[PDB]
Design a protein around this nucleic acid. Structure first.
Ligand SMILES: N#Cc1cccc2c1[C@]1(CC2)NC(=O)c2c3c(c(O)c(=O)n21)C(=O)N(Cc1ccc(F)c(Cl)c1)CC3
Ligand SMILES: N#Cc1cccc2c1[C@]1(CC2)NC(=O)c2c3c(c(O)c(=O)n21)C(=O)N(Cc1ccc(F)c(Cl)c1)CC3
Ligand SMILES: [Mg+2]
Ligand SMILES: [Mg+2]
Ligand SMILES: [Mg+2]
Ligand SMILES: [Mg+2]
Ligand SMILES: [Mg+2]
Ligand SMILES: [Mg+2]
Ligand SMILES: [Zn+2]
Ligand SMILES: [Zn+2]
Lengths: 368, 184, 368, 184
DNA sequence: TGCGAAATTCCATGACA
DNA sequence: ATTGTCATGGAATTTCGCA
DNA sequence: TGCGAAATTCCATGACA
DNA sequence: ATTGTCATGGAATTTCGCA
């Protein structure tokens, strides 16, 4: 734009150029004496190349890129042009980190009854014990009651064998699990269909979604650690002991053990509660139905100062699951198809695939 | 006197020898006295070792105050007495040749023996895989006396597997002839 | 204590036992009718065994252990006894997690001059490039000016070879590094003594202490990632480019590049600052001496709600560096010998060894 | 006219062939015109490739506006001209057989040639390891004309290695006889 | 109708790799 | 086509025992 | 002596494995 | 015998251009 700069040298006002400054020609280029010093005003036709040259030195953000440009040049609304280049640099978009936290977590309602929802997951590989390396952990969502099964692999076959033993007691409505190979297999889907069980899956690479069982994995490992202090790590024979110990452990916030929430009465274990001795089983089951409905339920915490919440049409980027060395931590921008809830979304990547992801594995694409 | 409760008494017994299924020949039957809830365990023998291995699985879920059984070798052994003493379980025996339990438990053990016989016929070598479905059937079977099934009495909720189809349990002329053909 | 319980059954007051309750004998044991129900009062001689039996079921904390005890018994100040057992259980002390955050971080003063302090560290293993796997990163503390050297191993020999090239320009007063084998070797100590360089070491397993170089490692990897997008990871030839790019990158908070802080003038690189063209070198060096002293310095942030600060004599526990599977995450209690600063301490373990550790790798032993 | 600054002009030249040391035979000498700061690079030859490999190390720290040299083959090549054009460096040559630099630079190149000769004598094959100490000596050598050493002028601070012991630089009768013994 | 202490509840911290 | 959880031990708050 | 917008400064977020 | 750091891009705040 040498035409725009021509009228400027003559002396007549152009929108964006303050009239209180002296615009002149020197060394075959339009200059301006500004407080900082004399800066070159490049024609609008040259600005894109300049912004890109400054940015490309170290692939810098807004201020660091602008500070280089401002060393030699001046033009109206420089940062508007800097931001246009930042938002078009694929290398920055996929490599840079986010500076916006996810919105506050959801505290899903506790399943209403025992057997409504199971949370299943694997622990391992553990030091070998009797040829076993893994533990299948099954947590009832309402009660917190856990079943432990030692396995040689986190496989469909080992899950099915264990679950056929457990489901002898009762069949659950839903089985929630992560996207581990053992649970996503067609053999496992077939095993569940065959029994009227609905398979619910966590968003990928988000163990918080399986929080109920993950949290129990900590308690299991903590108790096995304590019991194995100054002894070889022979955990296999301790799984039954740990299962019974944890199922009969009080949750200080609930003031009930998972066994009490499941049966409404303690079995012949140490320090069994005797408070319902004079009640009939029906009276006892009536008190249990009341206890199960009045359990403490946490509420979503406050949003942080700089959190983001997904919006349909928004450009977001999924996090690379296992990024290789010196490779981007983010995928190319995706579009938000549906906002399932403020923490879960359906996205469409550049391939055209529909993915249900957690916002913890997403960043909103910067500079719109 | 205090009302009857689940885990007050577990009635145990062995069923077998049965045709081999996955190397198993026996079924240890555990029935809670109050609820009538049944747990079944396949064993390779009616031995103390097989009883202890099976009951260690059950006692990781719930411990009974009392275990009731006949004077079978597996239950009268000093090893089984030591196992119970270790867990604070009192052992209770019926007089030899006089098996006494309770009306509800005697009726339940009849249903178990009859349901097993009904499903054995045609596939007597495939009962190991049927043990989970046999238990669910039994535990979701309505009690005329109590108004509730063993599952309702144990968990205080309805089940996701109601066994509305109250089957014959009695054998057909085809099953009778097939069972008498197997006894050859 | 059957003597203490004898006077109780008679009816005369004992300190700790409310007089408004009815204490009686039944089934050969002292009982009490309390609001919750009838509880057994065990003699003081039996209480330690009871507390330990309840605790040992699942190695539970204060409330979860007490809730089991309260099922059968009652006695004055039960939790005082529970806490005595919790504080004596070695398994809980070394396995449980802390629930007290470290005190707020220190923001050490920026070294006054270039070459006062260098922060050195290794990046790698990286995908092999020309037989090279590592990068030795040397950051001048005052300026932020960085030197990059490709190495085949994070060894003393490779560090010495690289530092003999760098020290041709200037010798630093101090070299700060972590406790990596390459820097703690007697050959490296000898190399530094030979040159009048003091070796300063970070507390073990605390890279925040080497924060200055760690932070530069992020920028180095981020720029190499960007430059290598859709190309093989041939980083070796990019180290000189990345070094020059970052040394000439503005820090938006300082409004100076590491090159400007080191030399007080830009070299012949793109967008070089021309603001001191009319100044003599002496005038320019005088302005640089002023710029170096007025740089922004951050202050320690607010302490969190539940932080802890070390005290001499306090029982603390060092974190196990690389805990094995199913093994405690904490060492046995240690005593704080000296509080070097609110974030660094000298501890004496049970072996009798003196260790200088960060409070980030410590928890105060619970229940005193 | 604007005052002289560091990086305005780098004067480069080759010293050698010298006795082999770690396979090296030459020293590329780079002296900043304004400060008199010296950077030394051992090369295996006075070639364009050796110059480019050595100057790529220096130009990763600081780029000069101008490089000044004599009409040596390595510096007049079209490859070296392409390398400079790529970096925005203007090449400047002295007239053949008339090496002109500046008083300060000519004096510095004299000190370099004399300091090298002094340390070669006795250990002419160990100069590679001495290059770091030779540079520190030179850069921490006070300038009578300017009042400051090259280090002070480049960094604007005192150094941690002040070279207070202003050595002879001239050879002893022992070193003279040892040097004349080497020339045999 | 209020005091000192014990009991209970709160809740930040951290780990489920 | 889904979603964080909860044991832990000091601190804060409430309740208890007595008057 | 004050308005609209541009420029600058602030600062939570996250990664140095 | 030592100790966190700082690029990043929206938001908050200040300054600029003009009157
Ligand atoms: N490894 C692996 C792996 C191996 C086989 C199959 C699969 C994985 C799998 C996805 C499927 N991949 C994973 O990365 C993975 C993890 C966890 C898993 O249970 C899990 O199955 N996976 C897991 O339990 N953790 C711990 C954790 C961390 C932070 C938390 F907030 C919570 Cl709640 C829990 C995280 C890693
Ligand atoms: N691995 C390893 C390893 C290999 C050889 C020698 C040594 C290690 C060594 C100690 C010595 N051991 C380590 O665990 C180790 C680390 C880091 C190191 O530089 C480092 O040298 N080490 C390091 O840079 N990081 C990244 C990080 C994480 C959180 C942060 F807040 C900061 Cl500032 C930086 C952490 C791990
Ligand atoms: Mg998993
Ligand atoms: Mg998991
Ligand atoms: Mg019998
Ligand atoms: Mg390191
Ligand atoms: Mg590091
Ligand atoms: Mg010459
Ligand atoms: Zn970029
Ligand atoms: Zn313990």
């Amino acid at each position: 734009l040498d035409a725009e700069l021509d009228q400027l040298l003559q002396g007549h006002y152009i929108k964006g150029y303050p009239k209180q400054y002296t615009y002149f020609l020197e060394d075959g280029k339009v200059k301006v004496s500004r407080p900082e010093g004399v800066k070159i005003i490049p024609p609008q036709s040259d600005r894109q190349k300049i912004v890109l040259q400054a940015h490309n030195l170290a692939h810098t953000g807004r201020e660091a890129t602008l500070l280089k440009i401002a060393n030699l040049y001046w033009w109206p609304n420089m940062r508007k042009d800097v931001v246009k280049q930042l938002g078009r640099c694929q290398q920055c978009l996929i490599t840079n980190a986010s500076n916006k936290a996810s919105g506050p977590i959801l505290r899903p309602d506790r399943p209403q009854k025992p057997f409504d929802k199971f949370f299943i997951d694997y622990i391992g590989p553990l030091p070998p014990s009797q040829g076993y390396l893994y533990v299948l952990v099954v947590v009832d969502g309402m009660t917190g009651f856990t079943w432990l099964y030692p396995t040689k692999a986190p496989s469909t076959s080992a899950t099915v064998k264990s679950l056929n033993v457990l489901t002898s007691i009762a069949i659950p409505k839903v089985i929630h699990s992560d996207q581990g190979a053992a649970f996503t297999s067609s053999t496992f889907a077939e095993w569940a269909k065959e029994r009227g069980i609905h398979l619910e899956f966590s968003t990928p690479y988000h163990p918080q979604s399986s929080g109920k069982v993950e949290r129990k994995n900590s308690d299991i490992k903590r108790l096995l650690t304590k019991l194995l202090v100054g002894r070889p790590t022979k955990w296999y024979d301790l799984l039954p002991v740990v299962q019974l110990a944890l199922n009969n452990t009080y949750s200080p916030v609930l003031k009930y053990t998972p066994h009490q929430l499941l049966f409404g009465i303690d079995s012949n274990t140490p320090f069994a509660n005797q408070d319902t001795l004079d009640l009939t089983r029906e009276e006892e089951l009536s008190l249990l139905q009341e206890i199960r409905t009045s359990l403490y339920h946490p509420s979503t915490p406050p949003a942080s100062s700089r959190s983001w919440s997904p919006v349909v049409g928004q450009l977001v980027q999924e996090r690379v699951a296992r990024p290789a060395s010196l490779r981007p931590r983010w995928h190319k921008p995706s579009t938000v198809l549906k906002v399932l809830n403020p923490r879960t979304v359906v996205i469409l990547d550049h391939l055209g695939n529909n993915r249900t992801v957690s916002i913890d594995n997403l960043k909103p694409t910067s500079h719109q | 006197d205090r009302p009857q409760k689940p885990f007050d008494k577990f009635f145990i017994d062995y069923i077998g020898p049965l045709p081999p299924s996955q190397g198993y020949l026996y079924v240890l039957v555990v029935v809670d006295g109050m609820t009538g809830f049944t747990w079944l365990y396949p064993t390779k023998a009616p031995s103390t070792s097989a009883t202890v291995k099976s009951l260690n699985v059950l006692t990781s879920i719930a411990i009974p105050k009392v275990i009731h059984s006949d004077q079978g070798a597996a239950f009268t052994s000093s090893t089984f007495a030591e196992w119970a003493k270790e867990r604070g379980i009192h052992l209770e025996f019926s007089t030899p040749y006089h098996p006494q339990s309770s009306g509800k438990v005697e009726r339940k053990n009849s249903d178990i023996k009859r349901l097993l016989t009904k499903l054995l016929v045609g596939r007597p070598t495939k009962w190991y895989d049927l043990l989970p479905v046999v238990q669910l059937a039994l535990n979701n079977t309505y009690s005329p006396v109590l108004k509730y099934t063993p599952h309702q009495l144990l968990f205080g909720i309805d089940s996701n597997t109601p066994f509305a189809n109250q089957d014959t349990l009695d054998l057909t002329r085809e099953e009778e002839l097939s069972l008498l053909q197997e006894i050859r």
